[PDB]
Write a protein that binds this DNA or RNA. Structure first.
Lengths: 147, 244, 490
DNA sequence: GCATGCTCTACTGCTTCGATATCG
DNA sequence: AAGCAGTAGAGCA
DNA sequence: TGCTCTACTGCTTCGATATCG
DNA sequence: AAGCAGTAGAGCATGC
């Protein structure tokens, strides 16, 4: 039933009235958090993690877009503290979608101002690097620049 | 340090006047110097600022991109530097004019607002000008008539109006100048008074208790049958503990 | 409420007659109303720039709102004052502005009723902040909009009763159709002319009420009284100079560091100490020791006995005097003792002496606490606060000394002539009104680039005296007042 | 008698604005 | 970072 | 030889900088 | 200083 609210959230933001987009985004992200964790059939869980992860549309590009604002704080905060329950509904099968989340959280930290949302970016990075241990999967992340 | 100027009343009452400074909030004259660990030195430390446009992923800029923008309501406007160098404000050099005088003693005790107080005193070199000011103040001293002087120091300085109190004493005859507020520095708001109270009335035994308090906690004493006041504890000669 | 705000709906009449020139050739009341609106926004853009404003025209042909009723059209939503909103409101002047209003809406219809009060109420019923004042300044002329049917007037006064149920206060600005009090019609069971004040007495001010400190005073060691220490001569100046990136109209938000021990790298603030240098010997400290040596007492006020009001001369001051007052927030029932001590201080003229440490870590300063009592009459003339005032005293190196070796006499003839001069130049001092030259020319200079009218309006100086108006007030006694007893003659 | 389902209000912490010491 | 008047070293003499 | 400039100079003013309640 | 929210040590009802 999803991707309706995804494209609704994607398209409702471009115009004015930047409190209406906030309340609609709160309602629809609550809808996604209700209607994606409830499902349990594993191929359909793969369908959901292939539905919310697209290179053109989705949550990563939607949180990439409206960061040059101040009104999209509650929805972005709900997204960034929802992804640390989505990294624990699933596991190391997300590993070919990892470096984009790392760059997302890194720019969201070094770009924003308020620590109502700056800390959960470090929460996602401190969950992710705790998970994906010292292996081949530590050579993508340039630790020599992160340090 | 000696300060010379020329006082004017009206069109041409230009009297050359000397002046000195008085009570001022004294400050220290030594700078704390930054020293890194392991070196016990300073010159091997570069402390600097970097001009870094963040807004985004950072693009580090130089100093010649800077418009000194100001706030206006819900936007930010230019006119950085040379525009305000054009339309700045001037007041044509030093000035010690008199606006007028006031016989009312309605300049109260609580509007003085000054970081320094001045003594306009005299002049030097065959001081007929200063005996003219002595005549001026020996006229002004009899009644509650004060002067409202407009003072500035140079063209860099700002203009300020203020009170010129008389001061007739034994050896010196002074006029003492203090600043004054503009009607942008006042603020006045409503308070709940306490005289007409329904809960906060104190009773008479408590009134006599605080009367005994203010009796038995005093510091001034009168004697020697002339009733000039003897008071100890002069908080004008006691040194300040900080620099000590 | 402290961070609470006040709204303002400006309701403008345009049905038939206010657009008329009153068969005159001076000015129309419509453009007079637009003069008043643009002046109150050009005042509150810098005076009180967080109030909530709105402007609504009623009676016209079109209608755009959120409820879709006839003859009601708004242009602004309840918001902060926006310079773009006043750069679109300034175009409605002159004949071409009247033409612009006429070709974007026109005017004239069977105009509104109770429903414009309804759209005011639903304009108020939507904004989620805190409200303290809610006033409607209506701009209309006529005194019977119910000139044909009584049900209109009955439902209008019932709707005004329901708006005064929640208490929304409306008080119009009546235009000058007779120039005053002649048309005293039945517009009186709704509400509970003067416009030059709104035109120019609001130039540049600020409004705030905080507390600045909430300390305690100790008499012996065990008499604790909770006081608040307000400031009443704020010593204001200009808003801060923001830095701006050149082309894309953005801030910079610069950084800073310290490094370079001739090796390069980066050094943290943990390895940093402070020092002082005399010639060769340098005394080294840590920053904890540097901030430690300015520690002498706790935060508070300390009683040190009493004094009579005769020795503390008004020659002595070093600080803008503050004001102190008791509050029943920390210690319960201390205003009772404060009211008793106030009564006996005003009955026995005595004033206290104290030692002051305002913040949590500061060297002390000796203060003196002086009593003060209110003044009042029937017009709620509250002009003086009931409480205590704090005069600040110098200690040791402030009172310097002059060379002291000058004393000459004078002769009593000039006292009466100087009395004549001071009585020529006599005036009661003030009650207000000595506004700031630099700040006034600065805010008008900012206004000139804000609204781009033509140019900097030359803000008139007021600190200068009127030299001709004291020349002719004086007369031709200047030369005799020079050389009556002291001729220079080179 | 030990490990969970379920409320709970005091504590602390960040933001907003305003005020004061500081090197130059 | 900016100015204003005092106060010992050159230049024409 | 005294006056007249002349680079310095103590000392002051806001001004941007930093701290805190 | 005002104020604004949200965590969280601290208890009650319940299962194996």
């Amino acid at each position: 039933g999803v991707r309706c609210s995804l494209l609704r959230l994607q398209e409702t933001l471009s115009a004015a009235d930047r409190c209406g987009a906030a309340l609609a985004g709160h309602q629809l992200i609550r809808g996604l958090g209700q209607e994606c964790v409830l499902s349990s059939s594993p191929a359909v869980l793969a369908l959901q993690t292939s539905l919310v992860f697209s290179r053109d549309f989705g949550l990563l590009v939607f949180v990439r877009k409206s960061l040059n604002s101040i009104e999209f704080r509650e929805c972005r905060e709900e997204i960034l503290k929802f992804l640390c329950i989505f990294l624990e509904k699933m596991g190391q099968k997300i590993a070919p979608y990892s470096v984009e989340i790392k760059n997302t959280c890194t720019s969201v930290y070094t770009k924003d101002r308020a620590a109502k949302c700056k800390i959960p970016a470090l929460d996602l990075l401190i969950k992710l690097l705790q998970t994906f241990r010292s292996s081949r999967l530590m050579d993508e992340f340039k630790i020599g620049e992160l340090f | 340090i000696h300060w010379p100027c020329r006082l004017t009343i009206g069109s041409n009452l230009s009297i050359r006047i000397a002046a000195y400074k008085s009570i001022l909030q004294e400050r220290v004259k030594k700078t704390w110097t930054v020293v890194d660990a392991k070196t016990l030195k300073k010159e091997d430390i570069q402390k600097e600022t970097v001009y870094c446009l963040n807004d985004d992923d950072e693009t580090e800029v130089l100093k010649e991109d800077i418009i000194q923008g100001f706030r206006y309501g819900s936007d930010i406007v230019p006119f950085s530097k040379v525009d305000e160098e054009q339309m700045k404000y001037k007041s044509e050099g030093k000035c010690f004019s008199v606006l007028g005088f006031c016989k009312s003693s309605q300049v109260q005790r609580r509007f003085f607002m000054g970081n320094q107080v001045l003594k306009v005193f005299a002049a030097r070199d065959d001081e007929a000008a200063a005996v003219a000011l002595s005549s001026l103040i020996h006229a002004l001293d009899d009644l509650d008539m004060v002067a409202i002087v407009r003072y500035a120091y140079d063209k860099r300085a700002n203009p300020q109006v203020g009170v010129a109190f008389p001061h007739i004493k034994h050896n010196y005859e002074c006029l003492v100048y203090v600043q004054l507020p503009f009607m942008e520095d006042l603020r006045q708001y409503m308070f709940s008074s306490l005289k007409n109270s329904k809960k906060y009335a104190p009773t008479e035994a408590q009134l006599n208790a605080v009367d005994a308090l203010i009796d038995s906690m005093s510091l001034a004493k009168k004697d020697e049958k002339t009733d000039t006041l003897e008071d100890l504890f002069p908080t004008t000669k006691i040194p300040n503990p900080r620099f000590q | 409420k402290y961070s609470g705000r006040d709204s303002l709906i400006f309701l403008v009449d345009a049905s038939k007659a206010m657009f008329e020139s009153q068969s005159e050739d001076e000015l129309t009341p419509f453009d007079m109303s637009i003069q008043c609106i643009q002046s109150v926004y050009i005042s509150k853009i810098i005076s009180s720039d967080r109030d909530l404003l709105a402007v609504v025209f009623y009676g016209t042909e079109k209608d755009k709102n959120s409820v879709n009723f006839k003859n009601i059209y708004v242009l602004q939503e309840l918001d902060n004052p926006g310079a773009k909103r006043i750069l679109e409101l300034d175009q409605f002047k002159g004949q071409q502005g009247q033409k612009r209003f006429q070709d974007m809406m026109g005017h004239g219809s069977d105009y509104s009723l109770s429903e414009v009060l309804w759209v005011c109420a639903n304009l108020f019923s939507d904004v989620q902040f805190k409200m303290s004042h809610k006033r409607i300044m209506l701009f209309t002329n006529e005194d019977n909009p119910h000139g044909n049917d009584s049900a209109k007037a009955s439902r209008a006064r019932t709707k005004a009763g329901d708006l005064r149920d929640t208490g929304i206060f409306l008080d119009l600005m009546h235009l000058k159709k007779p120039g005053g009090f002649d048309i005293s019609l039945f517009y009186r069971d709704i509400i509970s002319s003067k416009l030059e004040d709104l035109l120019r007495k609001v130039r540049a001010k600020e409004t705030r009420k905080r507390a600045l400190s909430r300390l305690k005073l100790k008499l012996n060691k065990d008499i604790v009284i909770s006081v608040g220490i307000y400031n009443l001569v704020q010593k204001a100046l200009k808003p801060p100079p923001i830095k701006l990136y050149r082309e894309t109209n953005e801030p910079v938000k610069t950084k800073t560091r310290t490094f370079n021990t001739s090796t390069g790298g980066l050094l943290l603030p943990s390895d940093t100490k402070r020092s002082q240098i005399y010639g060769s010997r340098q005394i080294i400290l840590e920053k904890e020791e540097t901030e430690e040596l300015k520690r002498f007492d706790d935060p508070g006020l300390m009683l040190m006995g009493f004094k009579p009001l005769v020795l503390l001369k008004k020659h002595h001051y070093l600080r803008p005097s503050l004001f102190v007052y008791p509050e029943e927030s920390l210690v319960i029932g201390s205003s009772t003792l404060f009211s008793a001590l106030l009564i006996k201080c005003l009955e026995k003229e005595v004033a206290a002496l104290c030692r002051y440490t305002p913040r949590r870590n500061i060297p002390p300063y000796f203060v003196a606490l002086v009593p003060q009592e209110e003044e009042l009459d029937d017009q709620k003339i509250q002009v003086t606060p009931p409480g205590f005032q704090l005069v600040f005293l110098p200690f040791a190196d402030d009172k310097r000394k002059m060379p002291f070796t000058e004393k000459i006499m004078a002769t009593p003839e000039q006292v009466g002539k100087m009395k004549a001069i001071v009585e020529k130049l006599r005036f009661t001092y003030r009650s207000d009104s000595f506004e700031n030259p630099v700040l006034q020319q600065h805010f008008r200079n900012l206004e000139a680039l804000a609204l781009d009218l033509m140019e900097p309006e030359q803000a008139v100086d007021l600190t200068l005296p009127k030299v001709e108006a004291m020349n002719k007030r004086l007369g031709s006694l200047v030369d005799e007042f020079k050389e009556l007893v002291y001729p220079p003659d080179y």
